[PDB]
Write a protein that binds this ligand. Structure first.
Ligand SMILES: COc1ccccc1N1CCN(CC#N)CC1
Ligand SMILES: [Cl-]
Ligand SMILES: [Cl-]
Ligand SMILES: [Cl-]
Ligand SMILES: [Cl-]
Ligand SMILES: [Mn+2]
Length: 340
């Protein structure tokens, strides 16, 4: 039976099932006011699937110059062509190699660059922005988006959307690495999974993906989405309440000190965007600081809503294309105010 919603993370996470349901705001606003993230499934079924394929991005934009990051060591690969990223997205033998001769796990940095998404890709912009869930919150001019309505006393978000493209992490060693490290944003955001690429050549890599989800602390209902519905999992997220951000800074200052980093007592390890919380660090956060987060697996078509101020990290299970839009809800406007 088709239902309006379900309750994940032992009823700590709302999951809306109809992205265009005009009554979604009634369930949403109760969870959102408490500072929780929210998941909306099914956005892929609203989109023109031919506009979101890696082959189309290579053919249309392949000659542009870009930088890439090696996710395993943070090294920057300077001034290559964007086709050099897209042509290895699913075919492992076509990826750029590290010194050791391994194919690299790569992230495409800042592409499209700055605020150019709309100028470069007008048809993709229309397709995404017309099908975003909770449109009164998420549209540039929605009635509950204050982004265009605030004075300079508030940090306003840039013009979006922004695209996040990166390979999947592969090995047992890769379990401790982030695609995007732990950080926070002063605006609200919605992040849509528009394509998941499950490779070939070293296709048969299914088992390490299951142990990553398991050790990642994912709930039993999340595991049923793979085994029972055969949905495509893209990325594993950890998200923490905005109110827990300083306790996370105290843990990371203490670990930095144990590892012989030399840091002023006041430096900000969350703003540094230098840490990924592995199973050891997450257990320490829980046991020593009393902090519990949300472990979320974002499948093809899932929209993740991230509250302003909430620290969060992302680990790609397979190759992903994500598209994100910033907004300023009235519930969370305190997080972007420039005083006190
Ligand atoms: C999305 O979150 C859930 C949580 C708990 C149980 C099921 C789901 N869904 C409902 C059906 N949905 C589309 C279909 N068919 C995929 C799986
Ligand atoms: Cl809040
Ligand atoms: Cl376009
Ligand atoms: Cl709405
Ligand atoms: Cl990062
Ligand atoms: Mn972010």
């Amino acid at each position: 039976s088709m239902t309006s919603h379900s309750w994940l993370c032992d009823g700590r996470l709302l999951c809306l099932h109809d992205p265009s349901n005009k009554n979604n705001w009634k369930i949403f606003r109760e969870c959102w006011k408490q500072g929780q993230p929210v998941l909306v499934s099914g956005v892929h079924k609203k989109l023109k699937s031919e506009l979101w394929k890696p082959e189309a991005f290579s053919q249309e934009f392949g000659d542009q110059d870009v930088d890439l990051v090696n996710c395993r060591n943070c090294a920057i690969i300077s001034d290559v062509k964007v086709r050099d990223f897209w042509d290895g997205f699913e075919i492992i033998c076509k990826r750029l190699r590290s010194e050791d001769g391994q194919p690299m796990v790569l992230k495409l940095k800042d592409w499209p660059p700055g605020e150019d998404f709309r100028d470069m890709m007008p048809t993709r912009f229309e397709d995404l922005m017309e099908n975003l869930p909770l449109p009164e919150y998420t549209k540039r001019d929605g009635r509950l988006n204050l982004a265009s309505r605030l004075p300079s006393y508030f940090v306003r978000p840039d013009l979006g959307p922004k695209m996040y493209n990166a390979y999947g992490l592969i090995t047992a060693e890769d379990r401790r690495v982030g695609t995007t490290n732990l950080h926070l944003d002063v605006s609200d955001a919605v992040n849509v999974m528009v394509y998941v690429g499950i490779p070939i050549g070293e296709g048969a890599h299914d088992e390490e993906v299951l142990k990553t989800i398991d050790e990642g602390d994912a709930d039993e209902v999340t595991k049923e989405r793979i085994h029972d519905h055969k949905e495509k999992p893209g990325a594993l997220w950890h998200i923490y309440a905005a109110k827990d951000a300083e306790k996370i800074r105290e843990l990371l200052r203490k670990v930095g000190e144990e590892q012989g980093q030399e840091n002023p007592p006041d430096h900000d390890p969350i703003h540094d965007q230098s840490w990924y919380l592995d199973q050891t660090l997450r257990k320490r956060l829980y046991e020593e600081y009393g902090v519990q987060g949300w472990a979320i697996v974002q499948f093809l078509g899932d929209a993740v809503f991230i509250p302003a101020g909430a620290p969060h990290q992302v680990h790609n299970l397979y190759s992903c294309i994500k598209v994100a839009e910033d907004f300023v809800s009235p519930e969370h406007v305190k997080h972007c105010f420039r005083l006190t």
